[PDB]
Amino acid sequence: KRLEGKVALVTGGTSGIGLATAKDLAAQGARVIITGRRQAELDQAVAALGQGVRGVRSDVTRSADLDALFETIRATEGRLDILFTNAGGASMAALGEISEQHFDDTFERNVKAVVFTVQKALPLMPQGASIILNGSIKGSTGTQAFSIYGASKAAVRALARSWVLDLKERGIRVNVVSPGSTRTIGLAELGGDTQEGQDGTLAYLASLVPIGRLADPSEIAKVVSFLASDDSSFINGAEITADGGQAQV
Amino acid sequence: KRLEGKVALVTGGTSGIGLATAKDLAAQGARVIITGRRQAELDQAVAALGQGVRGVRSDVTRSADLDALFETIRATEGRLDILFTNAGGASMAALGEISEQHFDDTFERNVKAVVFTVQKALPLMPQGASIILNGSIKGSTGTQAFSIYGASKAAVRALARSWVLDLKERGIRVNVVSPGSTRTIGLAELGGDTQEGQDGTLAYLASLVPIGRLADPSEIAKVVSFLASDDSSFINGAEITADGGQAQV
Amino acid sequence: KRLEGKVALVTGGTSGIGLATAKDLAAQGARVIITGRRQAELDQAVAALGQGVRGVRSDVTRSADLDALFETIRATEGRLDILFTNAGGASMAALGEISEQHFDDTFERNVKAVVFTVQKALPLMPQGASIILNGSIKGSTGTQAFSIYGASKAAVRALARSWVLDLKERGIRVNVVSPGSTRTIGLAELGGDTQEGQDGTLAYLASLVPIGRLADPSEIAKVVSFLASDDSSFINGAEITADGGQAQV
Amino acid sequence: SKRLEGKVALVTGGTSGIGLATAKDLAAQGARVIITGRRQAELDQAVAALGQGVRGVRSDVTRSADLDALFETIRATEGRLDILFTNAGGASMAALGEISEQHFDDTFERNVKAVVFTVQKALPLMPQGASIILNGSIKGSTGTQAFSIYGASKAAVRALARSWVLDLKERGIRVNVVSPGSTRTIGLAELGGDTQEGQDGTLAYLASLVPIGRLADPSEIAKVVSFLASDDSSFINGAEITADGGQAQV
C-alpha cells in the first residue's frame, strides 16, 4: 500500500507491460487510469483489473483525445502523481523498404505522443511526481529491419535527460524503463500470423536472453512501480534496463 | 589524393560543418556534390570550394527534391561512394511550451530527412561505400529547452546501429560523427540577433568546453574525412565524438 | 516482510550507504551480516542496527578475514541470498602526483577485494540469489585528481557484465548501483578536517546535482533493496544510477 | 605522407600485433618512433623490419626501473614526446570461481598500473598539443565468459582518460582511447590455444561474431591510432573510438 493515495495514469493500459503495470500499481493502492483505442479491450482490462481502476477510451496521436483524457482527470481526481506511457508500437521494415507512412506512424505514436502526453499532464502533476517513459534495449542496440523502431526508442530515452532540467523547478523527475524481450501479444503478433510460427519466434528470442527466458510482463511492471514510488527519490534522468542481461553483455 | 576517384554528397554543404567537410573532401581529390536551400549561398559556396565541388539546390524535407538530386547524380557521375548528412537544425522550446510545429519541423529535418536521404542514396552506393550521419553530444546529454533537438540527434545515432545490419550484405558501412560546440553561423544564431548577444552566448559555451575553446568547423570535418576514407574500414555503426572533452568528463 | 527468510551480507556496513542498506534490508526482514574494518565502530553500528543485524570484524583486502567471515555465515545461517559490497575508498591524487601505494590501495579494496568477496561467497549462495556491487558515477565521468578512483569504479561495473555469463548456470544475478554524491562521513572527510571546509565542499557538490541536493544514504539503500528483492528478477548485469540527474544530463 | 613529420612517438609493446602495426604506420607518416619490447631478439626484428628511424628499447613496463631507463633515453636523445601509445597489455581467461590472486594481479599490473605510471613518467617530456592514446577493448563495455578480469582492466583504462582530460587540461595534452574488436594477432591466435587447428577454429568463430564477418587486420586498428596521434584529432578529448566491425554497436 506504499502508493496509496497516489493517482497513476498508464497510456496503453489494455495490454502487455502497461496492463501488468496498471495491475501492479493498483495492488499498491494507487488509483489508476488506463487508456485504450478500442472500447471492448478497455472494458475487459478495466473489468480484469478492477481494484478501483478507471479506463478512458483514447488515441494518444490526436490532441482532442489527450485534452478530453486530462480533462477527465482534472474533473475526477485533479492531481496526477504517476505517469507511464505504454502506447507505443513496433513494425518491421528494412532500409530500402521503409515507407514514409511507416516512419510517420512509428514516431507519432512512439515519440510525439509521449511529448504531448507529458506536456498536457504537467499542470496536474504536483512537485515530487514521477514520470516513467517507455524505452527499449532496441534503442541502444542493432536489430535488422527495425531501424525506425530503435531510433524512436533512443529518442524517448534522450527526452528524459533534457526533461530533467526542464522539470527541475516543478520537482517532477523523469526516468526511463527499457525492457528486453517480454512475453506479450505485441511480441507474439510480431512473430507471425501462425500460432506455432509466432511461437518459434518467441523460442528464438528466449535463446538470445542470457538467463534464457522471456520476461513475464510483471517483472517489467515491478521496475515501473519502483520508479513510481518514493524509493526512487534520488533517481532522475536514468535508464533502468530489464533485459535478462541481453544488452548488458 | 587519398579520396580521388571517389564521389561524395554533402547535404547542407553551404554552411558550417558541411561546408568545411566539402572543402576537406575536395582537397583529398573527391568529387563533391553539395546541397543548399538558397541558390545564392549554394553558388557562392561552390565558387569558393573549387572545380571538384558542384551544387544542387534542394530541401531535404521535400521528397521531390531528394529524388531530383539523386537522379542528377546518377546521370552526372553514376555512383555515390561517400554520403554525409549535414542538413539539420536546432530550435529551443522548454517542456510546457513545445508546439506541434516545433516538433514536426525538427524531426522531419533531422530524422525523417536522414532516413530518406540514405534510402534514396543506396542504389548509387557501391560495396565499400561509407555513410556518415550527423549526431550531437546533445543526443547523449540533457540541455534545458533543447529536448526535441537532443531526441532527434539520439534517433540519428540509433539508426546507424541497425543500418549496419541492414547494409551488411551490401558492404556499406554507417557511422556517426557527434560534434560538441562548434563556431558556425547556426551556433551564433541560436545565441541571439544582437551581436553582443551571440558573443556572450559563444563565450559561455566555450567556458563549458574543457579545453576552453569552441571547435573550428574544420576540426569536425577532419573526423568526417577519416570516416569517409578507407582507413575507417573496420569502423561500423560507431559514434566518434569530437567535443573537446565536454561529454566525456 | 519482503526479505523475510533472506540472509544478506553487506561489507563496509558500519558507515554511510552500507549502514543505510543494512538498516533497510533488516527492516525488510532480512537477516543481515555487516562487516567492519575497525572493532569499536563495528560494535556501535550493530547496536544501532540492533535486532536482525550481526557483525563480523574483517578487512576485505586480507583473505583470512574473508575466510573467517564466510565460515561463520556458513556455520550459522548456512546460505547467502543477498551480497552487497560497500567496502571501498576514494583518495585524491592528480596525474603526476599519483603514488604506487595510492594505486595499490585503491585497486586492492575497490576491485580486487570485490572479486574475492564474490568468489568466496558463491558456495553459500543459492539459485536465485542477488549480488549488488558498489559503483559510482565517477566510473563513467571525469573528475580532476580522482582518476584512479574512477578507474576502479569502472572496473567494478565491468565485472558485472561478464559475471552474468559466469553465473548463469548457478542462477545468481549481478547488478551495480552507482550513487551520485551522497551525504556521508567519508564525503565530508574528503572535503577535509575544517568543519567549515566540509560544509563548503558539501554545498559545492549539491550545486552540481540538478535537483540541487545531496542524497540521503537511505535513498541509495532503497536501490540496493530493490535489486536485492525478487522484483529485480529480470535485471542482470545492469547499472542503476541514483545521482539526482548529474551524470544523466 | 609527412603529416606526422617532426613528431616523436613512443609505442609500448611495439614488437607485435597492433603496436607493431602502429609503429609502422606512424613511421610511414614521418614520425620518429620508439618501441619497447620485453625480449631483445623480438625487439631487434621489429626495429630492423620497421627501418625508417625507429629505435627499440628493451623494457618491461611493469618494472619501474625499466620505465625510468626508457624515458631517460628519450630525454637524452629526442628531448620530447609528442605521441604516446600504450600497447603493452595481456589477456588470460579465468571464470569466476577459478580466479586466482596471481591471475588478478598480473592482469591489473600490466593492463592498468603500468599504463598509469607509463603516462605519469612520460608527462614532463610531453609539450602542449601532445596526444596520448590508451589501449582499450570492446571487452571493457561487454560481457565475455571467463574474461571478467580482463574486461574490468580495459574498462579501467577507458575511465582513466575521462579524468585525465581534466588533470591534463592546462598542460594541453589530450587523452583518447582506441577500443578494438577482434583483430588477427598472434596474441589473439595464441589465446585460441597451442594447436593451429584450435587457433583456426577459434579465429573462425570470432569472425562469425563480427557483423562485417571478418577479423581486423592490425593495420586497420593502427589507422585509428594515427588519426588520434595526428593534429586532425585536435577537438577529440577523452573519447573512445571503437573499431570493432560493428560488433559492440549492434
- Any binding-site annotation on C182? yes
Backbone angles phi, psi at A133, to 5 degrees: -100, 145
Which residue, chain included where needed, has cell 506504499? A2
HEC string for C157-199: HHHHHHHHHHCCCCCCEEEEEEECCECCHHHHHHHCCCHHHHH
For residue B168, how many other CB atoms are within 10 A of its CB?
21
Contact A160 C248 (CB under 8 A): yes
User: For chain D, which residues lie within 8 Å of any Cβ of chain A, measuring from their own Cβ?
Assistant: 142-144, 211, 246, 249-250
Reference D150, options D87, D90, D209, D240; nearest CA is D90
Subunits next to A (3 or more Cβ pairs <8 Å) are B, C, D
Q: Which residues in D lie closer than 8 A to residue B165 (C-beta atoms)?
A: 211, 246, 250
Q: What is the dihedral of CA A171, B99, A60, A10, to 10 degrees?
A: 0
**Pairing mode of beta strands A31-36, A7-11:** parallel
Q: Which residues in A lie closer than 8 A to residue B98 (C-beta atoms)?
A: 115-116, 119
Q: Which residues in C lie closer than 8 A to residue D174 (C-beta atoms)?
A: none
Nearest chain B residue to D237, by CA: B245
Resolution (Å units) = 2.4
Nearest CB to A103; choose among B98, B115, B156: B115
- Residues in Cβ contact with C156 at an 8 Å cutoff, skipping those fewer than 6 apart: C110, C111, C114, C133, C134, C135, C139, C176, D152
- Any binding-site annotation on C12? yes
Alpha-carbon distance of D47 to D91, in angstroms, equals 25
Nearest CB to A249; choose among D142, D211, D249: D142
Q: Return binding residues of B.
A: 12, 14-15, 17, 37-38, 59-60, 86, 109, 134, 149, 153, 182, 184, 186
Angle CA D157–D158–D159, to nearest 5:
90
Q: Tell me, rounded to whole angstroms, the distance of Cα C83 from its chain centroid.
A: 9
D62, D109, D110, D167: best to mutate for the C interface, most C CBs within 10 A = D167
Phi-psi region of C31 (alpha: psi -120 to 50; beta: other; left: phi over 0): beta
Contact C222 A240 (CB under 8 A): no
C116-127 burial by CB neighbour count: b if 16+ within 10 A, else e? bbbbbbbebbee
Backbone angles phi, psi at C124, to 5 degrees: -75, -20
H or E stretch at C233: none
* Amino acid present at C108: E
How were these coordinates obtained? X-ray
**Which CATH number is associated with domain D8-181+218-243?**
3.40.50.720
User: Angle formed by the axes of helices B39-49 and B16-27, to 10°?
Assistant: 30
Which residues of B are known catalytic residues? Answer: 149
Reference C18, options C185, C204, C140; nearest CA is C185
Fold of domain C7-242? Rossmann fold (3.40.50)
- Any binding-site annotation on A184? yes
Chain B nearest-CA distance from D46, in A, is 23
Chain D nearest-CA distance from B131, in A, is 14
Given a contact cutoff of 8 angstroms between Cβ atoms, the answer to whether B176 and B240 are in contact is: yes
Reference A83, options A213, A177, A152, A2; nearest CA is A177
Contact B210 D242 (CB under 8 A): no
- Residues in Cβ contact with B64 at an 8 Å cutoff, skipping those fewer than 6 apart: none
Contact A96 B157 (CB under 8 A): no
Given a contact cutoff of 8 angstroms between Cβ atoms, the answer to whether D52 and D98 are in contact is: no
Domain ranges of chain D: 8-181+218-243
Alpha-carbon distance of D118 to D61, in angstroms, equals 7
Nearest chain A residue to B93, by CA: A166
* Amino acid present at D118: T
* Amino acid present at C133: L
Chain A nearest-CA distance from D151, in A, is 11
Reference A118, options D243, B95, B84, B146; nearest CA is B95
Reference C177, options C143, C227, C141; nearest CA is C227
Alpha-carbon distance of D155 to D108, in angstroms, equals 11
By CB atoms closer than 10 A (0-12, 13-18, 19+), residue B71 is exposed
Contact C249 A219 (CB under 8 A): no
Contact D155 C157 (CB under 8 A): yes
Contact D241 B242 (CB under 8 A): no
Alpha-carbon distance of B38 to B16, in angstroms, equals 15
Alpha-carbon distance of B238 to A185, in angstroms, equals 33
Contact A143 B162 (CB under 8 A): yes
- Residues in Cβ contact with B2 at an 8 Å cutoff, skipping those fewer than 6 apart: B28, B29, B225, B229
Alpha-carbon distance of B36 to B231, in angstroms, equals 29
Taking CA atoms, C154 is separated from A241, B197, C111, D86, D130, in Å, by 18, 41, 9, 19, 26
Q: Which residues pair with A36 in a beta bridge?
A: A57
- Any binding-site annotation on D194? no
B166, B168, B239: best to mutate for the A interface, most A CBs within 10 A = B166
Helix (H, G, I), strand (E, B) or coil at B241: strand
Nearest CB to B248; choose among C142, C210, C245: C142
By CB atoms closer than 10 A (0-12, 13-18, 19+), residue C186 is middle
HEC string for A50-112: CCCEEEEECCCCCHHHHHHHHHHHHHHCCCCCEEEECCCCCCCCCCCCCCHHHHHHHHHHHHH
> Of D71, D147, D150, D227, which one is the catalytic site residue?
D150
Chain A nearest-CA distance from B40, in A, is 31
- How many residues are present in chain C? 249
Alpha-carbon distance of C139 to C155, in angstroms, equals 8
Chain D nearest-CA distance from A233, in A, is 28
Q: Is the C-alpha dihedral spanning C47, C52, C58, C59 positive or negative?
A: negative
Alpha-carbon distance of A155 to A107, in angstroms, equals 9
Contact C144 D123 (CB under 8 A): no
Contact B219 D227 (CB under 8 A): no
Q: Which residues in C lie closer than 8 A to residue B142 (C-beta atoms)?
A: 210, 245, 248-249
User: For chain B, which residues lie within 8 Å of any Cβ of chain C, measuring from their own Cβ?
Assistant: 141-143, 245, 248-249
Catalytic residue status for C204 = no
Taking CA atoms, B243 is separated from B179, B237, C43, D165, in Å, by 6, 19, 50, 12
Nearest chain D residue to A143, by CA: D250
